[PDB]
C-alpha cells in the first residue's frame, strides 16, 4: 500500500528493488542502499528534467506510479496488478503508458508475461538475460543493456588469454543464473576448456547451506579459479562461507558481483585479487549534485527515504543528527547503472513525443487521437526505432547514442575490474571488451603474488589420453617419440639424444658396426707381448753366429704380431671375403715356413719328397692366390648385433670381420695351417719330438680358441687376444725350433 | 471465446490441453485425442455422477467453467483471467470455488502464481514436478500424483539392476525437463553411474533441429542406452529424427513418453524394445460405457467434439458417415490418467461437503455463511486433510484411498513397460516400483536380442584410473598384482601362476637355488666317458700280469668319475664348507697317489726323502682332516642368482655349491693337488718326462677350467663338464704312468 503517486497528463510505472529480500517468513528485509534508493531517485531526477524541457513534450506533463518489488517475482506480480486494474474492467482511471522494468531477470520475465496481455510497452534497465530476446514470446519488451550472450564470451576469453583450462563453476538459481552458465559452457567447448565441477546455490530444495559447495570446490585442488554467475545476495554469502573455512581461490565473477564495495565487507582477504566484469558506463555529473542536496526534511515525496536515512547513519528520528551533514563525497559514490536508468526514461519520452508530433501536428497538447493509446503502434512503430544522443553525457564516442536493435537490446561492451589494497581496499579497471578482449596484465594484483595456473594434468616421455587430462609415460632409450603422443621404436645403432623426436647420433658401434676407439689402447698393451716375441725371435736369429729357412719361419712368427695388430690395410680388414683369405694366409704362412723347415731340408727319409713339398706349398699358394684375388673389398665391418641396444664393438680401428666372412675365414685359416700339422702328425728323430711337442700345444691352443671363435662381446676382444695368444703359442714353437739346434757355435 | 459454461450453485474451473500446440505463428494446431478430449469428458462424467449423488452435496448443484490451454503457459494465463475477473473488481458475478489444474508442469506453475493472489485452491492431475512442493511459494497447490523426486529414483535403479554405468541423457525444456534431469544426476552419483553426454531440446534458442542431438548421441558409441526426460511433443520428433538416420539405441523414458501407441506411429522399428515408466493406475470401467455412447448429435454441450469426430474418422460434416459406428473397442482404449482426473474432482466435492456440514448443520442448502467463501479455510483446514475411498474403483489395496500428505502430493508408485511385437506392436507391463524395484527380466524383448551393455572401458594386467574409465595395462611375469589396481613386483625364485594376486610356484631354481632335474640326464651322458676311464684304468691294471701304489693312483683317477658324479652324500654336496673341503680332498687324493708314486718308491736320489714324503702327505691329511671335520652341513645349494628371473640351475640332483663356498673350495682343491705338481716341477729320468709331459697338460687344462671356474649359466654345466674333463685329463696322466712301465711281462 506504500507507493509514490504524482498525477499528470501521462503516467509512467516503475519497479525497483527498494527493499532487500526478507530473511524468513517476513516479506522483505532491510533497505537496498545502492541498487535501491539511488536508482529510484534517478527516475525521479529524470522526470523533473523532462518536465523542465521545452523540445521534449512541452505541452503534456509526465506522471509517475512507482512501486517496490522487494526482490521477489511473486511480490512483483502482486504489485503489478495496479497497472492493469483500470484497463481490465471498462464496461459499466489511471492508464499506464509504459513500465520501467525491474532489475532482476526473474522479475522482468514475470511481469513481461502479464503486461503483454494488455499491450503495455516495457523497457528494463540492468536486466541481462539471453532468453528475454525471444520476441515470439516477449513481443512488448526492450532494454538498454546488452544480453548475457556477450558476457559469456568476455569471460571465456579471459580464461583463454591466461592458460586457465581446468576451472570450476558456481551458478545461482532463477533465470540470470542457469541461462548465464548454460551459455558459458558452450563458449568453453570452442576453446577446449574443461569444467572440474558445476554447483548451484539458492534458497529452496538445493541443499548447500553455502558450505557443501565450498567443500566441493576444495575436492579438486587442481582448479584454482572459480567462475561465478550469481546474484548480489549469494555473492555475499559464499564469500562469508569461504572466510570461515579460511579457503582462498581467484574469483572470476560476472556483473552480478559487479564492482560493489559492500559484498566484500568484513571478509576482504578472501576476495583480494578478484577479477570481475561490469557494464561500460560513465557517471552522470548532474545526478551527484541532486542526490547530495537531499535530506529527510525537504524530501517529503519519498516515503522510503526515512528508513534509508537512519540505516545509512545509524541514527533515529541508537542515538537520536539534526546538524548532521547530508550526503556528500565522504560517504557516497554513484552506482554504475544510473546512466542506463536515465536512458530508459528518456526512451519513453522521445517515443511518446514522436507520437504527439504525428497524431496531433496542430497542437502541443493532447489531441483527441491520444484519448486511447495504441500499445502496439507505440511499441512496434515508434519505440523500437528511436535514435537520439544520450542526455547529460558529453560526446564520448559511439556509446553516446541511445538505440535499440532488431531484438530490442543494447550494445555488448564491458569492463574488467580487480580488487586491490593500498589497508584500505578498492577496485581498479584493468581491462575492456568491445568484441575483442584488450586487458593490461602488468597492473593486476594477483591473489598469491603470481599468475595462477589451473590445468588438469602436468606437462622424452609419451603422453596419451577429454582434452585436458593426460598421463606422462616415459619410454626406454631405444624408442623415439614419433609424435608428442607416441614413442614406438628407434634405430639399431643410432642413439637418440635430448628430445627423442627422431633417432640421432648414428652409432658406429651397433654390433653389426664396430665402434672401436678402445681396442687400439688394448692393442698397444697387447703389442708389447707381440714385440717380445719379435724381440725374442731377433735374439734367436743373432745366436746363429738351412739358415735362411729358419729366418723365414721367424718371419712368419714375427708376422703374427703384425697380423695380430692388423687383425690392416683398412680400419676393418676382416670385411670382405679377401680379408678373411688374407688373414688366413698369414696363419698358414707361419705354418708353411715351419712345415717347409720340418722335412723339406731334412734329407729325404724311427719307422715313422719333391711331390709332397710341391703339394704342401700348392695349398698355401692357392690360399694366398685366393687372398690375392680379394685385394679389393678388403675393408668392412664385423656383424655381432645382439638384442642389447648399446653394442659398440670395441676393437682396434673399429670392429671389422665381415660378419660371417670372418667365421669362415677363421676356420679356413686353421685348415691352411692344419696341412702342415697333419703332415707332421704322421710320424708316430729328436726334431720330430720337438715338432710333435709343439704340435701337441697347438691342438690345445686351438681348443681354447674354439670357445673364443664362437664367443664375442670384451669377449670378442678376449677372443681377439686368444688369436694373438695363438700366434704367441706358435712363437713358442719357434722357441722349440731354436732348441732343435746345437750350442757352442 | 470458446468454452463450456454450465451454471450452478457452485462453479468449478478446469484447464485441459484440448488443442495441440501450433506449428508456427498459429496459436494451437490439431486436436489432442487422448490427453485432450478424453480427459475433458472425464471431468464432465464425474460432475454428472456427483449431481446424481445423495450423500455428496445433495442440496447444492455443481457448475463448471472449462477452458483450453493449447499446451502453452502464455495462452493459459490469458484464459485464466476469467476465473479472477469477477473477484478483482467488487466495489461500485461467477465466483470460482476451485480450479482443476493443468496437465503440463509449466502451465500449472504459471497459473498457481496468479491464483495464489486470490486464495483459490487448485488440484492438478498429471503434473509431476519437484519444485511444485515448495509450499513457501505455492501455498494453494495440491495434486493427486507423486512428484518427480520418485521418478528419478525408479530409473536410477533400473540402470543399476542391469550394469549400465555409461549412459547419455536427453532432456526437454520447461520445468518438467530440467528439474527432472537435475534430480536424476544426483541419484546417479550415489550409484557410481557416469553420464556420457547431456543434451537439451525445445523450440527457441537451443539449436538442435533434432538432428544435432542424434549425431551427438552417435559420437559416443560406448553408451548404448539413452535416458529421456521429455514431453510428448519432443518424443515423437526425436524418434522420427532417429528413423531418418536409421540409428538404433535402447530407450529408457519417463512418463512423458508413457505408454502411448501414437508416439511411435510410422517409426516403430527405431523404438522396438524400449523401456518406459508410467504411473500406477486402474481403468475406470464406468467411464468406458459413457464414452462409447457419444456421437456428434447428442453431445451438444461439447463445442470441440465436432473437430474431434472428423479428425478421428477422416470424415466431414474428404468423404462426407451417418450410419458410421460410434466409439467402440475396435478403435478406442482408455488413457492411463483418467483415474487421477476423476479423483481430483471428488477432492473438491468432499472438501466442500465437509464445509457445508460444519458451517450449515441445520440445512442441506447454501446457508448465508457460504455467501463469501474463505479460500484459506477451505484449503488449509478442509481440503488438505481429506480421506475417502476412491469411487468407481473396487478395493485394490492401499491405492484405493485418496489422500494428500504434508506437501499436498501423492504416493510414489510406478510401472515398467516394454514395447514388443507379435507385425502388430503393443506394450506389456514387465515391472513395478513401490519403494523397491521389482521387475521380471525373462519376458523382456530386447532391441538386439541380447541384454545391452554400456560401460566406459572394457575389463594378469593392472588397471588404474572418474569411476567408470580405466586403462588395462599388463605387467611383466616378474611382478604380481598386489591389488586389482597395482602390480609392483614378485618373488625371486617363485614363478606366479594364473592370476598374479600373489607370488606362487616356489621355484627350486632361482640362481641361488638349483632347479636341477636335467643335469642328471647330462650326468648320465657324461658318466659314459667317466666309465671309459674306469674301464680303461681297469684294463691297465689287468696288464700287470710298487704294484699297490699304481692301483692306488688308479683309484684316485677312478674316484674322479665318482667325484664328478657327486660334484654326493646329499643332492647338493657342494653346500657347506665341508663339502668344498670334501671335494677338494678328492682332487688332491688323485694327485697325492700320483705324487707318492713319483718319488716315494723311486729309490732316494740328471742333475735335477722321508721328511719330504711326510710333509707332502701331511698337506693331504690336513685337507682331508678339514673336510672330515665338515661332515655335517654337507648339503646345500649353489648361489648363481642373475638379473634374469628364470634362473633354474640345471644340475644333477639340483645345483649345490654353497655359493662362494664352492669358489673357495675349487681354488683350495687346486692348491692341494698343486703341491704334487709343484714338487715334480723341480726336476728341470724317462719317468720324469712322462710326469713332466703330463704336468704340462695339467697346467693347460687348469687354464681352460679357469674361465669355466668363473663362468656359470649350461655354462655352469659346461663348466661342470670342464671339471669332469680335468679328471679325464688327469686320467690321461695315468695312461702316461702305464706308459712308464715295461712290456713283455
Ligand atoms: N545482471 C543482473 C540481473 O538481474 O540480470 C544480476 O543481478 C543484478 C541486477 C542489477 O544490477 O540491478 C543485475
Ligand atoms: N509428467 C508430464 C508433466 O507435464 O508434468 C510430462 O508430460 C505429460 C503430462 C500428462 O501426462 O498429461 C505429464
Ligand atoms: Ca526487481
Ligand atoms: Ca534472477
Ligand atoms: Ca495444460
Ligand atoms: Ca513442461
DSSP secondary structure of A548-589: HHHHHHHHHHHHHHHHHHH---SS-TTSSHHHHHHHHHHHHH
Sheet holding A10-16, edge to edge: A4-6, A62-68, A10-16, A96-100, A122-124, A141-143
* Residue A128 marked ligand-binding: yes
H or E stretch covering A171: strand A166-171
What is the DSSP track for B42-94? HHHHHHHHHHH-SSSSSSS-EEEEEEE-TT-HHHHHHHTTHHHHHHH-----P
Cell numbers at B443, concatenated: 519376458
The SS3 call for residue A440 is coil
Q: Out of B74, B113, B134, name the one closest to residue A204 (CB).
A: B134
Q: Using the mean position of ligand 1's atoms as its centre, give its distance from the Cα of residue A126 in Å.
A: 5
For residue B320 the three cell numbers come to: 462426407
* Cα–Cα separations (whole angstroms), residue A326 to A302, A313, A335, A561: 16, 10, 18, 115
The answer to whether the CB of A495 falls within 8 A of the CB of A505 is yes
Grid cell 534508493 — which residue?
A37
- Cβ distance B124 to B175 under 8 Å? no
B83: exposed, middle or buried (C-beta count within 10 Å: 0-12, 13-18, 19+)?
Answer: buried
DSSP string, B553-613: HHHHHHHHHHHHHH---SS-TTSSHHHHHHHHHHHHHHHHHHHHHHHTSS-------HHHH
State how far the Cα of A561 lies from the Cα of A556, in Å rounded to an integer: 9
Instruction: Ligand 1 pocket test: pick from A110, A132, A232 the residue with the most ligand atoms within 8 Å of its Cβ.
Output: A232
* Residues comprising chain B, all counted: 745
Q: What would the grid cell of residue A552 be?
A: 723365414
Question: Sheet containing A250-253: which strands, arranged edge to edge?
Answer: A194-200, A166-171, A225-229, A250-253, A275-279, A414-421, A425-433
Strand partners, B487: B481
Rounded Cα distance between B696 and B554, Å, is 20
Tell me which residue of B55, B417, B7, B456 sits closest to B221, measured CA to CA.
Answer: B456
Instruction: Tell me if A113 and B77 make a contact (CB, 8 A cut-off).
Output: yes
Ion ligand 4 — residues with CB under 5 Å?
A 104-106, 174, 176
Single out the residue of B16, B14, B13 nearest to residue B32, CA to CA: B16
3-class DSSP state of B745: coil
Beta bridge partners of A199: A170
**Ligand 1 nearest-atom number relative to CA A125:** 12
- Tell me phi and psi for residue B275, to 5 degrees: -130, 120
The 8-class DSSP code of residue A319 comes to: B
Q: Are strands B486-489 and B10-16 parallel, antiparallel or unpaired?
A: unpaired
CB atoms within 10 A of CB B27: 12
Q: Is A737 helix (H, G, I), strand (E, B) or coil?
A: helix
Whether residue B27 lies within 8 A of chain A, CB to CB, comes out as: no
The Cα-based distances of A268 to A70, A246, A328, A425, A726 in angstroms read 27, 12, 25, 8, 91
Decide: helix, strand or coil at residue B543. Answer: coil
Q: Residues lining ligand 1, judged by CB closer than 6 Å?
A: A 35, 103-105, 126-129, 176, 231-232, 255-256, 337
Do A401 and A410 meet the contact criterion of CB atoms below 8 Å apart? no
The C-alpha cell that represents A138 in the structure block: 516477449
What cell does A210 get? 553455502
Pick one of 3.40.50.2000, 3.40.50.720, 3.40.50.2300, 1.10.3720.10 as the CATH number of A4-147+283-402: 3.40.50.2300
C-alpha cell at A604: 729325404
- Give the CATH number of domain B4-146+338-402: 3.40.50.2300
C-beta of residue A519 within 8 angstroms of C-beta of residue A650: yes
Strands B96-100 and B122-124: parallel
Q: Can you tell me the distance from the alpha carbon of B590 to that of B669, in angstroms, rounded to the nearest whole number?
A: 11
- Cell numbers linked to B289: 460405457
> Does A371 show up as a binding residue in the annotation?
no
* Alpha helices (runs of H) in A494-546, residue ranges in sequence order: 519-542
Q: At what angle do helices A519-542 and A547-566 cross, to 10 degrees?
A: 170
Nearest one of A528, A632, A503 to A579, comparing CA atoms: A632
Kindly state the cell numbers that stand for B170: 536427453
Reference B353, options B41, B87, B101, B54; nearest CA is: B54
Question: For residues A321 and A344, what is the distance between their CA atoms, to the nearest angstrom?
Answer: 36
3-state DSSP helix/strand/coil percent for chain A, to nearest 5?
40, 15, 45
Say whether B119 sits in a helix, a strand or coil. Answer: coil
Q: Give the strand pairing for A194-200 and A166-171.
A: parallel
Which ligand sits nearest to residue A72's alpha carbon? 3
Instruction: Identify the H or E element spanning A167.
Output: strand A166-171
User: DSSP secondary structure string, B251-315?
Assistant: EEE-TTTTT-SSTTTT-GGGTTT-EEEEE-----HHHHHHHHT--TTT-TT-TTHHHHHHHHHTB
Please work out, in degrees rounded to the nearest 5, the angle formed at the alpha carbon of residue A466 by the alpha carbons of A463 and A471. 25
Degrees, nearest 5: CA angle B411-B414-B418: 170
Q: Which atom of ligand 2 is nearest to the CA of B17?
A: 12
Taking Cα atoms as reference points, which of B412, B409, B414, B413 lies closest to residue B101? B409
Dist. CA A497–CA A509, nearest whole Å = 16
Extract the C-alpha cell encoding B349: 466435492
Q: Are B43 and B64 in contact (CB under 8 A)?
A: yes
Q: Are the C-beta atoms of A591 and A678 separated by less than 8 Å? A: no
Half-sphere exposure (Cβ direction) of B193: Cα atoms closer than 13 Å:
28
The distance of A304 to chain B (nearest Cα, Å) reads 25
Candidates A20, A19, A69, A62; CA nearest to A43 is: A62
Put simply, whether A220 touches B (Cβ < 8 Å) is no
- CA–CA separation, A81 vs A88, rounded Å? 10
CB within 8 Å of A741: residues ≥ 6 apart: none
**Dist CA A211 CA B616 (whole Å):** 95
C-alpha cell at A187: 563458449
Residues on chain B touching A78 (C-beta within 8 angstroms) = 117
- Closest ligand 1 atom number to CA of residue A39: 12
Between positions 467 and 496 of A, the ones with CB within 8 A of B are 471
Flag if B204 and A78 touch (Cβ within 8 Å). no
B166 bridge partner residues? B194
List all residues 6 or more positions away from A540 whose beta carbon is below 8 Å from its beta carbon.
A554, A734, A735, A738
User: Order of strands, edge to edge, in the sheet holding B194-200?
Assistant: B194-200, B166-171, B225-229, B250-253, B275-279, B414-421, B425-433
Q: How far, in Å, is the centroid of ligand 1 from the Cα of A230?
A: 9
Q: Is B697 on the interface with A (CB under 8 A)?
A: yes
Q: How far apart are CA B597 and CA B553, in angstroms?
A: 8
Residue B178 contacts A where some CB pair is shorter than 8 Å: yes
Q: Residue A127 annotated as binding? A: yes
Cα separation, A564 vs A574, whole angstroms: 12
Closest CA in chain A for residue B77: A114
- A127-131 contacts, C-beta under 8 A, 24 or more apart: A127/A101, A127/A102, A127/A103, A128/A176, A128/A255, A128/A279, A129/A105, A129/A175, A129/A176, A129/A179, A129/A180, A130/A179, A130/A180, A130/A183, A130/B205, A131/A175, A131/A179, A131/B204, A131/B205
Gaps in chain B (C to N distance exceeding 2.5 A) after: 92, 317, 320, 422, 459, 465, 545, 567, 605, 608, 684, 713
- Please give the Cα distance from A556 to A544 (Å, whole number): 18
Tell which A residues from 100 to 129 touch B, by Cβ distance under 8 Å: 110, 113-114, 116-117
How far is B312 from B327, CA to CA, in rounded Å?
10
Count Cβ atoms within 10 A of the Cβ of residue A276 and give its class: 0-12 exposed, 13-18 middle, 19 or more buried: buried
Q: Which H or E element spans position A613?
A: helix A610-629
Q: How far is B568 from B551, CA to CA, in rounded Å?
A: 23
Helices B339-359 and B39-52: crossing angle in degrees, nearest 10, is 30
- Picking from A282, A176, A314, A151, the residue whose alpha carbon sits closest to that of residue A235 is A176
DSSP one-letter string for A336-360:
GGGHHHHHHHHHHHHHHHHHHHHH-
Q: Which residue of B has its CA nearest to A92?
A: B92
Closest-CA residue to A130 (of A229, A236, A17): A229
* Specified resolution (Å): 3.5
Domain borders along chain B are 4-146+338-402, 285-333, 519-739
Cα torsion B145, B148, B152, B157 to 10°: value is: -20
Under 8 Å between Cβ of A126 and A17: no
Whether A389 has a binding-site annotation, put simply, is: no
C-alpha cell belonging to residue A392: 547529460
Residue in B258, B233, B252 with CA at minimum distance from that of residue B337: B258
CA distance A53 to B474: 85
How far from the centroid of its chain's Cα atoms is residue B698's Cα?
Answer: 72
Cα–Cα distance for residue pair B241/B247, rounded to 1 Å: 9
Nearest CA in chain B to A149: B205
Q: State the Cα torsion B281-B287-B292-B296 to the nearest 10°.
A: -110
C-alpha angle A495-A500-A503 in degrees, rounded to nearest 5: 45
Comparing C-alpha atoms, which of B219, B143, B255, B131 is closest to residue B182? B131
H or E stretch including A593?
Answer: helix A577-599
8 Å CB contact between B432 and B440:
no
* Residues having C-beta closer than 5 Å to ion ligand 3: A 17, 69, 102-104, 107
User: How many CA atoms does the CB half-sphere of B644 hold within 13 Å?
Assistant: 8
Candidates A38, A97, A102; CA nearest to A62 is A97
Cβ neighbours around A629 below 10 Å, total:
11
Contact yes or no for A379/A140 (Cβ under 8 A): yes
Q: Is B135 on the interface with A (CB under 8 A)?
A: no
Sole residue written with cell 697346467: B699
Secondary structure of residue A196 in the 3-state scheme:
strand
Question: CA nearest B17: which of B179, B233, B193?
Answer: B233
Count the neighbouring beta carbons within 10 Å of the beta carbon of residue B215.
12
3-state secondary structure A320-342: CCCCCCCCCCCCCCCCHHHHHHH
CA torsion through residues B287, B290, B296, B299, sign = negative
**Cell numbers 580464461: residue:** A159
User: With left for phi above 0 and alpha for psi between -120 and 50, is residue A654 left, alpha or beta?
Assistant: left
Alpha carbon distance B655, A524 (integer Å):
42
**Residue A720, helix vs strand vs coil:** helix
- Strand partners for B175: none
Query: CB count, 10 Å around CB of B688?
Result: 18
Amino acid at each position: 500500500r506504500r507507493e509514490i503517486k504524482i498525477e499528470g497528463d501521462l503516467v509512467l510505472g516503475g519497479l525497483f528493488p527498494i527493499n532487500e529480500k526478507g530473511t524468513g517468513t517476513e516479506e522483505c528485509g532491510r533497505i537496498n542502499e545502492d541498487r535501491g534508493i539511488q536508482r529510484l531517485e534517478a527516475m525521479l531526477f529524470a522526470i523533473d528534467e523532462i518536465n523542465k524541457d521545452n523540445y521534449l513534450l512541452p505541452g503534456v506533463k509526465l506522471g509517475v506510479h512507482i512501486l517496490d518489488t522487494c526482490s521477489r517475482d511473486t511480490y512483483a506480480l502482486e504489485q503489478s496488478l495496479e497497472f492493469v486494474r483500470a484497463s481490465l474492467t471498462k464496461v459499466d482511471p489511471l492508464l499506464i503508458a509504459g513500465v520501467i522494468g525491474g532489475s532482476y531477470s526473474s522479475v522482468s520475465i514475470q511481469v513481461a508475461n502479464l503486461l503483454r496481455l494488455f499491450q503495455i510497452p516495457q523497457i528494463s534497465y540492468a536486466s541481462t538475460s539471453a532468453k528475454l530476446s525471444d520476441k515470439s514470446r516477449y513481443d512488448y519488451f526492450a532494454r538498454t543493456v546488452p544480453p548475457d550472450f556477450y558476457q559469456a564470451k568476455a569471460m571465456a576469453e579471459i580464461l583463454r588469454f591466461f592458460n586457465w583450462t581446468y576451472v570450476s563453476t558456481v551458478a545461482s538459481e532463477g533465470d540470470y543464473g542457469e541461462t548465464g552458465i548454460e551459455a558459458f559452457e558452450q563458449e568453453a567447448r570452442l576453446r577446449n576448456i574443461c569444467i572440474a565441477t558445476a554447483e548451484k546455490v539458492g534458497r529452496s530444495n538445493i541443499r548447500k547451506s553455502y558450505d557443501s559447495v565450498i567443500r566441493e570446490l576444495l575436492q579438486k585442488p587442481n582448479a584454482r579459479v572459480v567462475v561465478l554467475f550469481m546474484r548480489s545476495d549469494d555473492s555475499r554469502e559464499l564469500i562469508a562461507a569461504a572466510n570461515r573455512v579460511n579457503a582462498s581461490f581467484t574469483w572470476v565473477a560476472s556483473d552480478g558481483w559487479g564492482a560493489q564495495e559492500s559484498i566484500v565487507k568484513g571478509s576482504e582477504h578472501v576476495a583480494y585479487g578478484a577479477i570481475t566484469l561490469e557494464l561500460a558506463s560513465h557517471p552522470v555529473r548532474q545526478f551527484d549534485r541532486y542526490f547530495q542536496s537531499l535530506n529527510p526534511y525537504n524530501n517529503h515525496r519519498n516515503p522510503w527515504f526515512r528508513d534509508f536515512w537512519e540505516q545509512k547513519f545509524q541514527c533515529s528520528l541508537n542515538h537520536r543528527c539534526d546538524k548532521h551533514l547530508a550526503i556528500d563525497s565522504s560517504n557516497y559514490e554513484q552506482e554504475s547503472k544510473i546512466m542506463f536508468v536515465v536512458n530508459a526514461v528518456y526512451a519513453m519520452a522521445h517515443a511518446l513525443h514522436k507520437m504527439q508530433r504525428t497524431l496531433c501536428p496542430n497542437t502541443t497538447k493532447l489531441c483527441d487521437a491520444m484519448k486511447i493509446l495504441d500499445g502496439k503502434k507505440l511499441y512496434k512503430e515508434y519505440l523500437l526505432k528511436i535514435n537520439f544522443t544520450a542526455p547529460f553525457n558529453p560526446n564520448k564516442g559511439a556509446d553516446s547514442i541511445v538505440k535499440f536493435d532488431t531484438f530490442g537490446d543494447g550494445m555488448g561492451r564491458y569492463n574488467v575490474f580487480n580488487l586491490q589494497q593500498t589497508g584500505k581496499y578498492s577496485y581498479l579497471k584493468v581491462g575492456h571488451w568491445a568484441e575483442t578482449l584488450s586487458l593490461d596484465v602488468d597492473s593486476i594484483h594477483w591473489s598469491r603474488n603470481s599468475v595462477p595456473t589451473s590445468q588438469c594434468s602436468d606437462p622424452n616421455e609419451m603422453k596419451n589420453m577429454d582434452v585436458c587430462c593426460w598421463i606422462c609415460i616415459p619410454c626406454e632409450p631405444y624408442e623415439y617419440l614419433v609424435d608428442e603422443f607416441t614413442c614406438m621404436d628407434c634405430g639399431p645403432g643410432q642413439w637418440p639424444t635430448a628430445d627423442l623426436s627422431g633417432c640421432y647420433n648414428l652409432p658406429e658401434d651397433y654390433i653389426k658396426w664396430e665402434d672401436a676407439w678402445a681396442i687400439g689402447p688394448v692393442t698397444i698393451a697387447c703389442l708389447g707381448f707381440l714385440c717380445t716375441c719379435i724381440v725374442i725371435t731377433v735374439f734367436i736369429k743373432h745366436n746363429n753366429t738351412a739358415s735362411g729357412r729358419e729366418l723365414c719361419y721367424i718371419l712368419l712368427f714375427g708376422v703374427s704380431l703384425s697380423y695380430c695388430m692388423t687383425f690392416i690395410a683398412k680400419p676393418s680388414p676382416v670385411i670382405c671375403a679377401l680379408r678373411r683369405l688374407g688373414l688366413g694366409t698369414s696363419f698358414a704362412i707361419c705354418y708353411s715356413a715351419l712345415l717347409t723347415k720340418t722335412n723339406c731340408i731334412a734329407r729325404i727319409f724311427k719307422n715313422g719328397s719333391s711331390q709332397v713339398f710341391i703339394c704342401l706349398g700348392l695349398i698355401l699358394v692357392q690360399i694366398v692366390m685366393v687372398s690375392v684375388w680379394l685385394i679389393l673389398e678388403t675393408p668392412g665391418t664385423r656383424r655381432y648385433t645382439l638384442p642389447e641396444k648399446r653394442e659398440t664393438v670395441i676393437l682396434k680401428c673399429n670392429v671389422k670381420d665381415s660378419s660371417m666372412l670372418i667365421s669362415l675365414t677363421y676356420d679356413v685359416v686353421l685348415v691352411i695351417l692344419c696341412t702342415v700339422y697333419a703332415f707332421k702328425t704322421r710320424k708316430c728323430f729328436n726334431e720330430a719330438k720337438f715338432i710333435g711337442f709343439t704340435m701337441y700345444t697347438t691342438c690345445i691352443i686351438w681348443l681354447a680358441f674354439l670357445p673364443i671363435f664362437y664367443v664375442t662381446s670384451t669377449t670378442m676382444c678376449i677372443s681377439v687376444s686368444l688369436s694373438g695368444f695363438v700366434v704367441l703359442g706358435c712363437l713358442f714353437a719357434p722357441k722349440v725350433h731354436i732348441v732343435l739346434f746345437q750350442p757352442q757355435k
